């Protein structure tokens, strides 16, 4: 500190390394800090999205796949990240999804957010941008503590508007009761009103899973299950136990992005955009191929 | 040929102004060290030797000493009042330094909502990460905690009650406390090693409810719970059954529990809060300490 | 079968998002490290790979870089402007950290009057004592320096000109500069290793004098001396002969000399002050940097 | 720092050592500081007059001498500090004079000050009180830099109103010119208007000293010389070269204290209060005796 808070240190380290091409350790003494600390803060700038590296070409991602995907599914935006062997697909989908949202969010707009590894992961890589552009966050679903891995990153300064309830009530009546507490009601409407949504997609509660497969549920968004035609599965108990925005209402959000990938995900992702729940998608190559395969059929 | 008093005053001057040793004084006036020791004892013993301190902090120290005696507190900080006029913000720096004295590494901290408390949490952020401190909410509200749970040792756990502060009915409150998403946190909360709260005086309450709460004899609240000037928790208040949070009896079960409080108006309230034993540590400003002490 | 561009974009993603090594990429796409190096060179070389930074500080860095090129400064700090709204006070923290980078131990610091400058001196107090820094006033006034010369390494020397800033006549000024109580300090002042001043824009001046100084084409002043938009010192100003202090020509004789300046309105003034070379280092706020840069 | 500025540390160290009688090193850990630092700050509290030790008896000083002195010279206040062998009389007069002024100054009153070892010394021992009670300082004389050893102690927060001129101009006309610069004029009136003055007294410029002795100057206050009858010596050149408040005007200040002591000082001190320039005096025993001796004659 000389006498700069962390953020400044990071923003500066960046400029010196990139815009001026200075040496890693030569930076060290110019801001009067240890060479190890320089090395750290350069990573933290990338991990938290202070540093944004844009690739400005039609070939950022797998162009061929992206374009077929827009065509077949009528997508407003699409990114297919270039494949890798054994990589943490969760973490890689992270960077991608963060970088796309950086291109989509206008200053002070509102981003609704789901739970789950990918979404939390994307939010981690978007903290720099979120505060830098005063993006306002709203939880799409209950849970409170499960969002903490993505919103624990931010400055006190950021508006994060949480639904004050757990993800799922223990019975359907309790869940209805909760949905009418002014507090929950308020954030629920807040969420619906957002500009852009970011959600994970689950593919398919030990006893319940078999019964879900039975009804030909293909995947889930925010906890709600849908078949391959994309329509939300009926007479599942969970759906009325969930506190949070129902899929019908998610649709209000002008641009809603799914970030999902993995070997089993293909048909759940596809069923997702047939249903209209997402109109933007971030995946990886192998999953893009898979989705297209599945369409030939 | 010198009076006792005249010899007391000579010794005073030499010891406290000329800073000489007793071996010096006893040697120089030809009196025994044994005598000198006794005569310094007598100068202090009564009347003569009086130590005054010149600074704004003297008043703080004083009110600190009285609060400590009068309310048998375990810990007190009186900060300078409106004279330095960042009283709110400086209040939070205080509490955060007091908490730093109290928390062992890996201990758990029960946490009230409110500005003073959110504020102090902010100042406290660095200690939390490095010392690996666990946090727990004392009440529902979730969003009103956000501004202070704001940063993270990736390793540091924060336990937030997933419910509103106040339910629209006692029954809805009761069925909510029974959700084990909520219950888990409630339980985790009273295992806390230290608690930190703010004190309110008499919006989740209507102007009407407050007027009535005033009528039933409430003087202040902690965690939304109102008590009278005797520090008894006020009875026949509906709000109490509608609250989702650790009850003031269960709060008292935490060994060290510190209050942060500011306003002139807050005096009656704070006084009552330590009569009821809801806090055994206080961080306040000099103006408020005065008011508190004048009300006795 | 991949285009050059398609191979540039793959490499970008792997290197900057997946953070892999070139030995990895070259190994995994079956292309030479030598090729990869060249293709990363080309991605940057033009268009494709662009590094953006997300923070308020980015703007500061930018304006810093431009001021540095456009005014060939030795040192620049642009601090965040009105967005953090303790702009005055935060301005002084800036300058004090810049000065800390510049002063060797036992060096001498020439000192201008004014809020910004007094303020920065305050922030700088600890460095002064420990590093044994010598101070000298650049001008008379005495009392207007008091608020910043406020503390002391018993060992630390402060050289104050024992005269008013401005004499009531050129003759009285001339005979005052000849008093060797005054002259001694004047001399000591230009031996200074670093100078720190504030910049004024267009009370020791009457409303009339200022209007006229505006008419003769003054844009700002340093140490009471006014200059035009070209940074030339304005001529045919009476005030200049009435001033007791180091003249702006003799000021320029100090190797490193830093300005601290704030207001929106101050843009024209500051610009002119570095065109005249009266400062070769600047500490300003982002709002002002913008205004300065827009005036070119 | 935990997290207390120096001043607080001092005020606290004091209370713990005196009002609670705690151990020197036991204090150390209670405020989390090194035992050497504890030892330092306890001295700094005494040296700068944060810590004031009052002795509340008629025998604080040499009572016998004090009372004779009030009687013979019509003094409003008098302190005669108990004698010591080979002690720095300058430094000892310091403590005394500081302690007396602490008893005389009402909150926010104005103290005019002369130059010289004793006065500067007294101001050093009064810094705690000065800021603690918002005492306003004004220089009685020019000099500017010669007051720096007493006013360098204070907080930025204290009003110190300096005469912006040197102590003595090089010619009498220059000195007159200066006395009419609005700036000097302003502080000059400020000085006259004070509540309490504190000044040193000089007893008797190699070539000039013999000529001063010649005219039967006995001592000096603020640079002005007076004979044994107390009247200001006439036709000395210095008197018209001095920038600062003349002795006639010093008299305006309701209570003005001299702090002077030393073997040669006796008759200069006496001539001082015969002239009316001081109406309060701080000395030491040996000088009090001497003054009284001189009156028998």
UniProtKB/Swiss-Prot annotation, chains B, C:
Domain of life: Bacteria
Leader sequence residues: none
Induction info: Autorepressed. Part of the lsrRK operon, which is positively regulated by cyclic AMP-cyclic AMP receptor protein (cAMP-CRP) in the absence of glucose and negatively regulated by LsrR.
Gene Ontology cellular-component terms listed: cytosol
Membership in a protein family: Belongs to the SorC transcriptional regulatory family.
Subunit relationships: Homotetramer. Dimer of dimers. Interaction with phospho-AI-2 triggers the disassembly of the tetramer into dimers.
Name used for this protein in its record: Transcriptional regulator LsrR
Gene name as annotated: lsrR
């Amino acid at each position: 500190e000389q006498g700069m808070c962390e953020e400044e240190q990071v923003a500066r380290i960046a400029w010196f390394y990139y815009h001026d091409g200075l040496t890693q350790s030569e930076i060290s003494d110019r801001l009067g800090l240890t060479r190890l600390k320089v090395s750290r803060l350069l990573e933290k700038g990338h991990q938290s999205g202070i540093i944004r590296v844009q690739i400005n070409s039609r070939f950022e991602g797998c162009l061929e796949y992206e374009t077929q995907l827009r065509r077949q599914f009528s997508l407003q935006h699409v990114r297919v990240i270039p494949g890798l062997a054994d990589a943490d697909v969760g973490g890689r989908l992270g960077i991608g999804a963060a970088h796309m949202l950086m291109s989509l969010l206008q200053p002070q707009q509102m981003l609704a957010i789901g739970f789950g590894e990918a979404t939390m992961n994307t939010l981690q890589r978007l903290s720099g941008f979120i505060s830098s552009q005063q993006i306002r966050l709203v939880t799409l679903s209950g849970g409170v503590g499960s969002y903490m891995t993505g919103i624990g990153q931010l400055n006190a300064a950021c508006s994060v508007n949480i639904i004050p309830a757990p993800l799922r009530a223990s019975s359907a009546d309790i869940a209805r009761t909760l949905k009418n507490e002014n507090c929950v009601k308020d954030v629920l409407l807040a969420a619906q009103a957002a500009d852009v949504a970011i959600v994970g997609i689950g593919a398919v509660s030990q006893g319940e899973q078999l019964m879900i497969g039975r009804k030909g549920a293909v995947g889930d968004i925010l906890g709600y299950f849908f078949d391959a035609k994309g329509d939300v599965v009926t007479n599942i108990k969970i759906h009325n136990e969930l506190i949070g925005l129902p899929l019908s209402a998610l649709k209000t959000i002008p641009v809603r992005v799914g970030v999902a990938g993995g070997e089993n995900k293909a048909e759940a992702i596809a069923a997702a955009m047939k249903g209209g729940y997402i109109n933007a998608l971030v995946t990886d190559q192998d999953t893009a191929a898979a989705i297209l395969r599945s369409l030939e059929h």
